[PDB]
PDB file of C-alpha atoms (C1' of nucleotides) in Angstrom:
ATOM      1  CA  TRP J   1       4.125   6.322 -60.553  1.00  0.00           C
ATOM      2  CA  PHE J   2       3.180   5.165 -57.090  1.00  0.00           C
ATOM      3  CA  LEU J   3       5.044   6.499 -54.095  1.00  0.00           C
ATOM      4  CA  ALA J   4       5.473   5.667 -50.427  1.00  0.00           C
ATOM      5  CA  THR J   5       6.064   7.976 -47.509  1.00  0.00           C
ATOM      6  CA  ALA J   6       6.393   7.511 -43.768  1.00  0.00           C
ATOM      7  CA  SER J   7       5.901   9.924 -40.912  1.00  0.00           C
ATOM      8  CA  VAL J   8       5.873  10.372 -37.143  1.00  0.00           C
ATOM      9  CA  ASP J   9       2.081  10.759 -37.323  1.00  0.00           C
ATOM     10  CA  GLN J  10       1.686   6.994 -36.755  1.00  0.00           C
ATOM     11  CA  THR J  11       0.566   6.683 -40.379  1.00  0.00           C
ATOM     12  CA  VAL J  12       2.231   5.691 -43.634  1.00  0.00           C
ATOM     13  CA  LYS J  13       0.811   6.857 -46.922  1.00  0.00           C
ATOM     14  CA  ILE J  14       0.850   5.579 -50.490  1.00  0.00           C
ATOM     15  CA  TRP J  15       0.589   8.248 -53.184  1.00  0.00           C
ATOM     16  CA  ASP J  16       0.052   8.446 -56.949  1.00  0.00           C
ATOM     17  CA  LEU J  17       2.394  11.272 -57.859  1.00  0.00           C
ATOM     18  CA  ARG J  18       0.826  12.103 -61.226  1.00  0.00           C
ATOM     19  CA  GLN J  19      -2.839  12.249 -60.156  1.00  0.00           C
ATOM     20  CA  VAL J  20      -2.916  13.882 -56.710  1.00  0.00           C
ATOM     21  CA  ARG J  21      -2.538  17.628 -56.154  1.00  0.00           C
ATOM     22  CA  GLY J  22      -5.039  18.430 -53.417  1.00  0.00           C
ATOM     23  CA  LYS J  23      -3.201  18.366 -50.065  1.00  0.00           C
ATOM     24  CA  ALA J  24      -4.048  14.873 -48.785  1.00  0.00           C
ATOM     25  CA  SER J  25      -6.155  13.767 -51.716  1.00  0.00           C
ATOM     26  CA  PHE J  26      -4.006  10.653 -51.371  1.00  0.00           C
ATOM     27  CA  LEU J  27      -4.442   7.114 -52.689  1.00  0.00           C
ATOM     28  CA  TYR J  28      -4.073   4.936 -49.586  1.00  0.00           C
ATOM     29  CA  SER J  29      -3.334   5.346 -45.881  1.00  0.00           C
ATOM     30  CA  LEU J  30      -2.149   2.612 -43.560  1.00  0.00           C
ATOM     31  CA  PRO J  31      -2.184   3.279 -39.803  1.00  0.00           C
ATOM     32  CA  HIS J  32       0.102   2.123 -37.041  1.00  0.00           C
ATOM     33  CA  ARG J  33       0.250   2.119 -33.269  1.00  0.00           C
ATOM     34  CA  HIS J  34       3.641   3.856 -33.079  1.00  0.00           C
ATOM     35  CA  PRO J  35       5.798   6.052 -35.320  1.00  0.00           C
ATOM     36  CA  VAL J  36       7.546   4.661 -38.382  1.00  0.00           C
ATOM     37  CA  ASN J  37      11.246   4.703 -39.122  1.00  0.00           C
ATOM     38  CA  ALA J  38      11.124   3.216 -42.558  1.00  0.00           C
ATOM     39  CA  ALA J  39       8.912   2.213 -45.450  1.00  0.00           C
ATOM     40  CA  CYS J  40      10.765   0.481 -48.259  1.00  0.00           C
ATOM     41  CA  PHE J  41       9.450  -1.171 -51.385  1.00  0.00           C
ATOM     42  CA  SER J  42      10.516  -4.470 -52.886  1.00  0.00           C
ATOM     43  CA  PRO J  43      12.539  -4.894 -56.024  1.00  0.00           C
ATOM     44  CA  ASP J  44       9.634  -6.726 -57.587  1.00  0.00           C
ATOM     45  CA  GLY J  45       7.318  -3.967 -56.470  1.00  0.00           C
ATOM     46  CA  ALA J  46       4.530  -5.960 -54.897  1.00  0.00           C
ATOM     47  CA  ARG J  47       5.655  -6.178 -51.263  1.00  0.00           C
ATOM     48  CA  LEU J  48       6.043  -3.158 -48.995  1.00  0.00           C
ATOM     49  CA  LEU J  49       8.064  -3.399 -45.816  1.00  0.00           C
ATOM     50  CA  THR J  50       7.400  -1.141 -42.874  1.00  0.00           C
ATOM     51  CA  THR J  51       9.361  -0.768 -39.700  1.00  0.00           C
ATOM     52  CA  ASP J  52       8.313   1.032 -36.563  1.00  0.00           C
ATOM     53  CA  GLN J  53      10.138   2.530 -33.576  1.00  0.00           C
ATOM     54  CA  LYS J  54       8.932   0.421 -30.647  1.00  0.00           C
ATOM     55  CA  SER J  55       8.623  -3.238 -31.579  1.00  0.00           C
ATOM     56  CA  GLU J  56       7.098  -4.352 -34.866  1.00  0.00           C
ATOM     57  CA  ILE J  57       7.580  -5.033 -38.541  1.00  0.00           C
ATOM     58  CA  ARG J  58       4.712  -5.175 -40.999  1.00  0.00           C
ATOM     59  CA  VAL J  59       4.421  -6.443 -44.530  1.00  0.00           C
ATOM     60  CA  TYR J  60       1.735  -4.970 -46.761  1.00  0.00           C
ATOM     61  CA  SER J  61       1.022  -6.399 -50.205  1.00  0.00           C
ATOM     62  CA  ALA J  62       0.032  -5.027 -53.580  1.00  0.00           C
ATOM     63  CA  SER J  63      -3.310  -6.701 -52.964  1.00  0.00           C
ATOM     64  CA  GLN J  64      -5.332  -4.410 -50.696  1.00  0.00           C
ATOM     65  CA  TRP J  65      -2.664  -2.266 -49.047  1.00  0.00           C
ATOM     66  CA  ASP J  66      -4.913  -1.791 -45.999  1.00  0.00           C
ATOM     67  CA  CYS J  67      -4.747  -5.182 -44.376  1.00  0.00           C
ATOM     68  CA  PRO J  68      -1.366  -6.764 -43.602  1.00  0.00           C
ATOM     69  CA  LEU J  69      -0.138 -10.182 -44.525  1.00  0.00           C
ATOM     70  CA  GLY J  70       2.183 -10.677 -41.608  1.00  0.00           C
ATOM     71  CA  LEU J  71       3.878  -9.200 -38.581  1.00  0.00           C
ATOM     72  CA  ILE J  72       7.521  -9.881 -37.806  1.00  0.00           C
ATOM     73  CA  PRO J  73       7.923  -8.794 -34.172  1.00  0.00           C
ATOM     74  CA  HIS J  74      11.440  -7.717 -33.323  1.00  0.00           C
ATOM     75  CA  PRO J  75      12.705  -4.923 -31.040  1.00  0.00           C
ATOM     76  CA  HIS J  76      14.613  -2.005 -32.578  1.00  0.00           C
ATOM     77  CA  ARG J  77      13.700   0.666 -30.044  1.00  0.00           C
ATOM     78  CA  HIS J  78      14.339   4.348 -30.746  1.00  0.00           C
ATOM     79  CA  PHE J  79      16.793   6.555 -28.875  1.00  0.00           C
ATOM     80  CA  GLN J  80      18.092  10.107 -29.183  1.00  0.00           C
ATOM     81  CA  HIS J  81      21.775   9.721 -29.965  1.00  0.00           C
ATOM     82  CA  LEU J  82      21.296   6.404 -31.770  1.00  0.00           C
ATOM     83  CA  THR J  83      20.910   6.234 -35.495  1.00  0.00           C
ATOM     84  CA  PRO J  84      17.407   5.105 -36.437  1.00  0.00           C
ATOM     85  CA  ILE J  85      17.081   1.596 -37.686  1.00  0.00           C
ATOM     86  CA  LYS J  86      16.204   0.628 -41.245  1.00  0.00           C
TER      87      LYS J  86
ATOM     88  C1'  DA K   1      60.370  12.295  25.440  1.00  0.00           C
ATOM     89  C1'  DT K   2      62.720  14.542  20.473  1.00  0.00           C
ATOM     90  C1'  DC K   3      62.758  14.881  15.115  1.00  0.00           C
ATOM     91  C1'  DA K   4      60.942  13.492  10.335  1.00  0.00           C
ATOM     92  C1'  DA K   5      56.556  12.852   7.402  1.00  0.00           C
ATOM     93  C1'  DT K   6      52.697  14.514   6.258  1.00  0.00           C
ATOM     94  C1'  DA K   7      47.578  16.067   6.536  1.00  0.00           C
ATOM     95  C1'  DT K   8      45.142  20.255   8.018  1.00  0.00           C
ATOM     96  C1'  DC K   9      44.719  25.102   8.826  1.00  0.00           C
ATOM     97  C1'  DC K  10      44.974  29.240   6.849  1.00  0.00           C
ATOM     98  C1'  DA K  11      46.704  33.812   3.759  1.00  0.00           C
ATOM     99  C1'  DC K  12      46.095  35.601  -1.043  1.00  0.00           C
ATOM    100  C1'  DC K  13      43.817  35.995  -6.284  1.00  0.00           C
ATOM    101  C1'  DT K  14      40.256  35.473 -10.139  1.00  0.00           C
ATOM    102  C1'  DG K  15      36.038  34.866 -12.529  1.00  0.00           C
ATOM    103  C1'  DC K  16      31.510  33.057 -13.219  1.00  0.00           C
ATOM    104  C1'  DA K  17      27.453  30.336 -11.624  1.00  0.00           C
ATOM    105  C1'  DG K  18      24.421  31.276  -9.097  1.00  0.00           C
ATOM    106  C1'  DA K  19      22.306  35.955  -6.214  1.00  0.00           C
ATOM    107  C1'  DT K  20      20.385  40.112  -6.575  1.00  0.00           C
ATOM    108  C1'  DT K  21      17.921  43.790  -8.542  1.00  0.00           C
ATOM    109  C1'  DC K  22      14.644  46.517 -12.225  1.00  0.00           C
ATOM    110  C1'  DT K  23       9.899  46.433 -15.201  1.00  0.00           C
ATOM    111  C1'  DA K  24       5.295  45.596 -17.272  1.00  0.00           C
ATOM    112  C1'  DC K  25       1.302  43.230 -16.012  1.00  0.00           C
ATOM    113  C1'  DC K  26      -3.023  40.139 -14.049  1.00  0.00           C
ATOM    114  C1'  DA K  27      -4.493  37.170 -10.189  1.00  0.00           C
ATOM    115  C1'  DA K  28      -5.407  38.632  -5.794  1.00  0.00           C
ATOM    116  C1'  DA K  29      -6.448  41.828  -1.508  1.00  0.00           C
ATOM    117  C1'  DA K  30      -9.678  44.932   0.236  1.00  0.00           C
ATOM    118  C1'  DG K  31     -13.773  48.310   1.008  1.00  0.00           C
ATOM    119  C1'  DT K  32     -19.454  48.450   0.615  1.00  0.00           C
ATOM    120  C1'  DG K  33     -23.470  46.761   1.251  1.00  0.00           C
ATOM    121  C1'  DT K  34     -26.700  43.338   2.265  1.00  0.00           C
ATOM    122  C1'  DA K  35     -28.265  39.047   3.939  1.00  0.00           C
ATOM    123  C1'  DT K  36     -27.513  35.324   6.601  1.00  0.00           C
ATOM    124  C1'  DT K  37     -26.438  33.133   9.668  1.00  0.00           C
ATOM    125  C1'  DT K  38     -24.377  31.788  14.541  1.00  0.00           C
ATOM    126  C1'  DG K  39     -22.651  31.558  19.765  1.00  0.00           C
ATOM    127  C1'  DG K  40     -23.051  34.075  24.282  1.00  0.00           C
ATOM    128  C1'  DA K  41     -26.456  36.451  28.044  1.00  0.00           C
ATOM    129  C1'  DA K  42     -30.489  34.659  30.814  1.00  0.00           C
ATOM    130  C1'  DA K  43     -33.067  31.166  33.200  1.00  0.00           C
ATOM    131  C1'  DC K  44     -33.586  26.057  35.039  1.00  0.00           C
ATOM    132  C1'  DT K  45     -33.438  21.076  35.974  1.00  0.00           C
ATOM    133  C1'  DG K  46     -31.587  16.787  37.490  1.00  0.00           C
ATOM    134  C1'  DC K  47     -27.846  13.430  37.154  1.00  0.00           C
ATOM    135  C1'  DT K  48     -23.572  12.771  38.805  1.00  0.00           C
ATOM    136  C1'  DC K  49     -19.920  14.201  41.758  1.00  0.00           C
ATOM    137  C1'  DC K  50     -17.313  15.721  46.624  1.00  0.00           C
ATOM    138  C1'  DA K  51     -16.953  15.257  51.882  1.00  0.00           C
ATOM    139  C1'  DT K  52     -18.323  11.563  55.746  1.00  0.00           C
ATOM    140  C1'  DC K  53     -18.907   6.814  58.500  1.00  0.00           C
ATOM    141  C1'  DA K  54     -18.648   1.809  59.671  1.00  0.00           C
ATOM    142  C1'  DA K  55     -17.591  -2.995  59.531  1.00  0.00           C
ATOM    143  C1'  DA K  56     -13.898  -6.315  57.529  1.00  0.00           C
ATOM    144  C1'  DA K  57     -10.045  -7.983  54.838  1.00  0.00           C
ATOM    145  C1'  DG K  58      -6.749  -8.162  51.972  1.00  0.00           C
ATOM    146  C1'  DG K  59      -2.649  -5.691  50.674  1.00  0.00           C
ATOM    147  C1'  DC K  60       1.784  -2.945  52.338  1.00  0.00           C
ATOM    148  C1'  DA K  61       5.747  -2.196  55.565  1.00  0.00           C
ATOM    149  C1'  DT K  62       9.264  -4.197  57.685  1.00  0.00           C
ATOM    150  C1'  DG K  63      12.630  -7.846  58.796  1.00  0.00           C
ATOM    151  C1'  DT K  64      15.195 -12.777  57.818  1.00  0.00           C
ATOM    152  C1'  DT K  65      17.305 -15.563  54.913  1.00  0.00           C
ATOM    153  C1'  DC K  66      20.062 -17.697  51.300  1.00  0.00           C
ATOM    154  C1'  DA K  67      20.473 -19.393  45.675  1.00  0.00           C
ATOM    155  C1'  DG K  68      21.892 -17.512  42.136  1.00  0.00           C
ATOM    156  C1'  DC K  69      23.522 -13.276  39.448  1.00  0.00           C
ATOM    157  C1'  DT K  70      27.072  -9.091  37.849  1.00  0.00           C
ATOM    158  C1'  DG K  71      31.042  -7.210  37.175  1.00  0.00           C
ATOM    159  C1'  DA K  72      36.534  -7.711  37.205  1.00  0.00           C
ATOM    160  C1'  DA K  73      40.934 -10.316  35.580  1.00  0.00           C
ATOM    161  C1'  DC K  74      42.848 -12.556  32.010  1.00  0.00           C
ATOM    162  C1'  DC K  75      43.670 -14.347  27.593  1.00  0.00           C
ATOM    163  C1'  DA K  76      43.670 -17.839  22.544  1.00  0.00           C
ATOM    164  C1'  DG K  77      42.514 -16.602  18.668  1.00  0.00           C
ATOM    165  C1'  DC K  78      40.148 -14.311  14.863  1.00  0.00           C
ATOM    166  C1'  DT K  79      39.078 -11.055  12.531  1.00  0.00           C
ATOM    167  C1'  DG K  80      38.783  -6.916  10.637  1.00  0.00           C
ATOM    168  C1'  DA K  81      41.563  -2.247   9.858  1.00  0.00           C
ATOM    169  C1'  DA K  82      46.064   0.031   6.649  1.00  0.00           C
ATOM    170  C1'  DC K  83      48.557   0.039   1.977  1.00  0.00           C
ATOM    171  C1'  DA K  84      50.358  -1.250  -3.049  1.00  0.00           C
ATOM    172  C1'  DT K  85      48.021  -1.417  -7.542  1.00  0.00           C
ATOM    173  C1'  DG K  86      46.252  -2.237 -11.418  1.00  0.00           C
ATOM    174  C1'  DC K  87      42.296  -2.577 -13.299  1.00  0.00           C
ATOM    175  C1'  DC K  88      38.138  -1.658 -14.405  1.00  0.00           C
ATOM    176  C1'  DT K  89      33.622   0.613 -13.398  1.00  0.00           C
ATOM    177  C1'  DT K  90      31.808   5.214 -13.291  1.00  0.00           C
ATOM    178  C1'  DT K  91      31.684  10.476 -15.136  1.00  0.00           C
ATOM    179  C1'  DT K  92      31.130  13.679 -19.142  1.00  0.00           C
ATOM    180  C1'  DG K  93      29.306  15.447 -23.876  1.00  0.00           C
ATOM    181  C1'  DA K  94      27.397  14.999 -29.068  1.00  0.00           C
ATOM    182  C1'  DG K  95      14.196  13.625 -31.154  1.00  0.00           C
ATOM    183  C1'  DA K  96       9.258  12.151 -29.333  1.00  0.00           C
ATOM    184  C1'  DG K  97       7.018  11.125 -24.824  1.00  0.00           C
ATOM    185  C1'  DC K  98       4.577  13.151 -21.678  1.00  0.00           C
ATOM    186  C1'  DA K  99       3.624  16.651 -17.855  1.00  0.00           C
ATOM    187  C1'  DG K 100       1.186  20.720 -18.003  1.00  0.00           C
ATOM    188  C1'  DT K 101      -2.578  23.916 -19.595  1.00  0.00           C
ATOM    189  C1'  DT K 102      -7.233  24.852 -22.075  1.00  0.00           C
ATOM    190  C1'  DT K 103     -12.699  24.039 -24.135  1.00  0.00           C
ATOM    191  C1'  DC K 104     -16.676  22.617 -22.788  1.00  0.00           C
ATOM    192  C1'  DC K 105     -20.055  19.516 -22.127  1.00  0.00           C
ATOM    193  C1'  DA K 106     -22.982  14.710 -20.742  1.00  0.00           C
ATOM    194  C1'  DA K 107     -23.028  13.284 -16.545  1.00  0.00           C
ATOM    195  C1'  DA K 108     -23.008  13.735 -11.508  1.00  0.00           C
ATOM    196  C1'  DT K 109     -24.735  15.656  -7.489  1.00  0.00           C
ATOM    197  C1'  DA K 110     -26.161  19.226  -3.853  1.00  0.00           C
ATOM    198  C1'  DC K 111     -30.670  21.105  -1.997  1.00  0.00           C
ATOM    199  C1'  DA K 112     -36.339  22.378  -0.912  1.00  0.00           C
ATOM    200  C1'  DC K 113     -40.485  19.845   0.402  1.00  0.00           C
ATOM    201  C1'  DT K 114     -43.029  15.753   1.831  1.00  0.00           C
ATOM    202  C1'  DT K 115     -43.596  10.854   3.133  1.00  0.00           C
ATOM    203  C1'  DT K 116     -42.636   7.403   5.209  1.00  0.00           C
ATOM    204  C1'  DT K 117     -39.937   4.866   8.350  1.00  0.00           C
ATOM    205  C1'  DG K 118     -36.206   1.837  11.047  1.00  0.00           C
ATOM    206  C1'  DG K 119     -33.614   3.489  15.194  1.00  0.00           C
ATOM    207  C1'  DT K 120     -33.667   4.655  19.811  1.00  0.00           C
ATOM    208  C1'  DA K 121     -35.450   5.403  25.023  1.00  0.00           C
ATOM    209  C1'  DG K 122     -37.198   2.981  28.068  1.00  0.00           C
ATOM    210  C1'  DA K 123     -40.115  -0.820  30.588  1.00  0.00           C
ATOM    211  C1'  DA K 124     -40.131  -5.841  31.226  1.00  0.00           C
ATOM    212  C1'  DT K 125     -38.442 -10.201  31.303  1.00  0.00           C
ATOM    213  C1'  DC K 126     -34.165 -14.387  30.352  1.00  0.00           C
ATOM    214  C1'  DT K 127     -30.145 -16.922  31.512  1.00  0.00           C
ATOM    215  C1'  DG K 128     -24.859 -17.782  31.289  1.00  0.00           C
ATOM    216  C1'  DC K 129     -21.571 -16.674  34.388  1.00  0.00           C
ATOM    217  C1'  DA K 130     -19.247 -14.867  38.991  1.00  0.00           C
ATOM    218  C1'  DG K 131     -19.049 -17.645  42.818  1.00  0.00           C
ATOM    219  C1'  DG K 132     -18.982 -21.843  45.491  1.00  0.00           C
ATOM    220  C1'  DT K 133     -18.129 -26.851  46.600  1.00  0.00           C
ATOM    221  C1'  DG K 134     -15.409 -30.465  46.200  1.00  0.00           C
ATOM    222  C1'  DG K 135     -12.453 -33.927  44.052  1.00  0.00           C
ATOM    223  C1'  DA K 136      -8.860 -35.346  41.128  1.00  0.00           C
ATOM    224  C1'  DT K 137      -4.437 -34.406  38.969  1.00  0.00           C
ATOM    225  C1'  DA K 138       0.434 -31.752  37.723  1.00  0.00           C
ATOM    226  C1'  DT K 139       4.073 -29.465  38.632  1.00  0.00           C
ATOM    227  C1'  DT K 140       7.995 -28.583  42.010  1.00  0.00           C
ATOM    228  C1'  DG K 141      11.679 -29.723  45.155  1.00  0.00           C
ATOM    229  C1'  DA K 142      13.953 -32.890  48.836  1.00  0.00           C
ATOM    230  C1'  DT K 143      16.106 -36.602  49.164  1.00  0.00           C
TER     231       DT K 143
END
DNA sequence: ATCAATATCCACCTGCAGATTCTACCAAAAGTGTATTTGGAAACTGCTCCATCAAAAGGCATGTTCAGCTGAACCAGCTGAACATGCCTTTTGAGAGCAGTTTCCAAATACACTTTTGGTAGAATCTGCAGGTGGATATTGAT
């Protein structure tokens, strides 16, 4: 009963699907400098991976979603006819 | 020169990718009226410019002379055009950044009046430099 979603708005949002109903009465919001191509949870559940379109990877933790633990810089640049990277 | 090869010129046909033409509108042209300038008629002065003279002097016209240069012939060689080819580099087609508008305002900046005020015209002094004077070198060419 917590959810993750990613968007071209340069933000990635963590929801609580049972509690929220109010059109962005969300739980947490993490910003970025560029768009996001993927936001995938762990198997254990405590580590969120996030992957942008220009050059970055971020790891956010269970503990205080806002601040990141670590950045893994690596270029996976976006392109029209290319399949986006995950 | 003659004949083969072969690119270029030139007739004839079709369709579609760009040319041309219709239509409803909004930024732009134009007519009034006023105010607000501004540049040409009129009238004058004074610096600088146009036609003359006179005593040199330094530059131009003309005339000799010869060292050194500009094509013309010719050619060893090099080096860069013409073709086979295969092979590999260049064309074509299947979402988010950013140029281009729009609001609208905190900040920037023209403009009326005065108050200074450094810059400029013009008189009154400096002195480094155009000349000169002379001696010692440094190129140059003959031999």
